[PDB]
Design a protein around this ligand. Structure first.
Ligand code: HEM
Length: 214
């Protein structure tokens, strides 16, 4: 569409359906993910968010991103570290895996953050909006399936204490996106990078799904 928010939604409509229909997400949605499979994805998201947020800090003041700087409400690294401590123990740092797909995803994040900051928004959009949408639905499935403490330990990643109304917040995040100044050509590259983002996620779920059945 015209506004970035709508252009992104329109451009990723297909890959999104493909992402939720991946073998791994379907099993997860039916409550058939194992503790080992869950530990794997969370370990992968750790590296992913560590890189993403690393690049966000680098570009937090660049106008091509700045309007979307939400460290207190969205950043996931700290939450993910609490989850690693929970699922892997005090030495999770040297214990967590780092799959090829994960490095490949991380690799793209650092290129974007380093040489194409004007595209970072596509990666933030893909991850954070999903976390406040389907991530919230998956959080409840994980709760019944894994049987974790009602205290929230092990699922800090799915919890956003500063966002009491995710629907409202997503609206504000979209409004901020439509505030970004960029030529029509950069906007197209941004929607395209968003596709890649989903793809990176899709191929990750394919890799992880293959590691489990293995
Ligand atoms: C587990 C399966 C999933 C389900 C059931 C699901 C469900 C949804 C729903 C219902 C919305 C619309 C919320 C709204 O209108 O504000 C949404 C939006 C979104 N989802 Fe998913 N999702 C899933 C997986 C994913 C994955 C794996 C990603 C990314 C890697 C993702 C990324 C997004 C994004 C970026 C949006 C925002 C779209 C926009 O408003 O422009 N989702 N999702």
């Amino acid at each position: 569409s015209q506004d970035l928010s709508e252009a992104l939604k329109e451009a990723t409509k297909e890959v999104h359906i493909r992402a939720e229909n991946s073998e791994f997400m379907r099993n997860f949605q039916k409550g058939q993910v194992s503790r080992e499979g869950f530990k794997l994805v969370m370990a992968s998201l750790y590296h992913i968010y560590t890189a993403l947020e690393e690049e966000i800090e680098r570009n937090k003041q660049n106008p091509v991103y700045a309007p979307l700087y939400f460290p207190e409400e969205l950043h996931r690294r700290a939450a993910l570290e609490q989850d690693m401590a929970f699922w892997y123990g005090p030495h999770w740092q040297e214990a967590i895996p780092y799959t090829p797909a994960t490095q490949h995803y991380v690799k793209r994040l650092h290129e974007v953050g380093g040489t194409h900051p004007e595209l970072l928004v596509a990666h933030a959009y893909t991850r954070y909006l999903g976390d406040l949408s389907g991530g919230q639905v998956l959080k409840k499935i994980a709760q019944k399936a894994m049987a974790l403490p009602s205290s929230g330990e092990g699922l800090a990643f799915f919890t956003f204490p500063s966002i009491d109304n995710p629907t409202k917040f997503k609206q504000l995040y979209r409004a901020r996106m439509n505030t970004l100044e960029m030529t029509p050509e950069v906007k197209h590259r941004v929607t395209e990078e968003a596709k890649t983002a989903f793809l990176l996620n899709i191929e990750l779920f394919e890799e992880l799904q293959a590691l489990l059945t293995e």
